[PDB]
Design a protein around this ligand. Structure first.
Ligand SMILES: COC(=O)[C@@H]1C[C@@H](OS(N)(=O)=O)CN1S(=O)(=O)[C@@H]1O[C@@H](CO)[C@@H](O)[C@@H](O)[C@H]1O
Ligand SMILES: [Zn+2]
Length: 257
């Protein structure tokens, strides 16, 4: 049903998913001057050395690279988190033009795209259970700006023509997500939600201050993907981002001064 078009997009989502108008929805604008430096925040622990990628998939609203989350291989911990979070998948949100595409914004600034590394809290056993918990998920968000290419992304971009339409998937093993991380792990963090339906309010957001640079040719290949399945009228998978939602009674904390 739901999508990013005029008739089924973000402004329509609340009808099937009333939590869309809830108290901790995502994404949000990160007002850098209002974010509070919290020296009690531990450093982020990103442990991806044993990551096992499995498949890459066009799911009708994004493309995602899925990982084996049946043991504590690639895990996120520390920072604002209590406990261990298993990497399940990563995916992107991007625009039709370089000046839009990100879901979070920084002082109202939009980036060309945003990378989401989705992790779930091992204390809840499976991701289905985790999405029902206020601290079930931790999503690492990384901004993409257009400039120099990101060499680590290229293996991803090169198989996108094999998953053009909704439903298509491919073997995608031995991909190293460390190749997608910026130098600094400085971050903002706040309690939020999934940014697609069901918009469940189960996410601790960890958004990195430092964007990665990707080339125009790389993001252009994102934009050749299709929302539609094969045999349906071609609608380009572009502008698959939800806009900033009301901050309401939340504080964004920064891990850095
Ligand atoms: C493309 O990713 C997904 O389909 C959803 C949305 C995306 O939310 S966001 N954009 O805030 O990172 C995350 N996942 S998800 O909710 O963790 C989605 O959840 C579970 C369903 O309950 C699992 O089947 C996972 O495969 C997971 O992808
Ligand atoms: Zn996302």
């Amino acid at each position: 049903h739901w999508g990013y078009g005029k008739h089924n997009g973000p402004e329509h989502w609340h009808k099937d998913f009333p939590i869309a108008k809830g108290e901790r929805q995502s994404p949000v604008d990160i007002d850098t001057h209002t974010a509070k430096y919290d020296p009690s925040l531990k450093p982020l622990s990103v442990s991806y050395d044993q990551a096992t990628s499995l498949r890459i998939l066009n799911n009708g609203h994004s493309f995602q690279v899925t990982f084996d989350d049946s043991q504590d291989k690639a895990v996120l911990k520390g920072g604002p988190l209590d406990g261990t979070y298993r990497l399940l998948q990563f995916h992107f949100h991007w625009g039709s033009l370089d000046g839009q595409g990100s879901e979070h914004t920084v002082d109202k600034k939009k980036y060309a795209a945003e990378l989401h590394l989705v992790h779930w809290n091992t204390k809840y056993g499976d991701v289905g259970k985790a999405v029902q918990q206020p601290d079930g998920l931790a999503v690492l968000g990384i901004f993409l700006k257009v400039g120099s290419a990101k060499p680590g992304l290229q293996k991803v971009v090169d198989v996108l023509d094999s998953i053009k339409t909704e439903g298509k998937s491919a073997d995608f093993t031995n991909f190293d997500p460390r190749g997608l991380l910026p130098e600094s792990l400085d971050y903002w963090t706040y309690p939020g939600s999934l940014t697609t339906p069901p918009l469940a309010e189960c996410v601790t957001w960890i958004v990195l201050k430092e964007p990665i640079s990707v080339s125009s040719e790389q993001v252009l290949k994102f934009r050749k993907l299709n929302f539609n399945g094969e045999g349906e009228p071609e609608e380009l998978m572009v502008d698959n981002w939800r806009p900033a939602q009301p901050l309401k009674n939340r504080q964004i904390k920064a891990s850095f001064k």
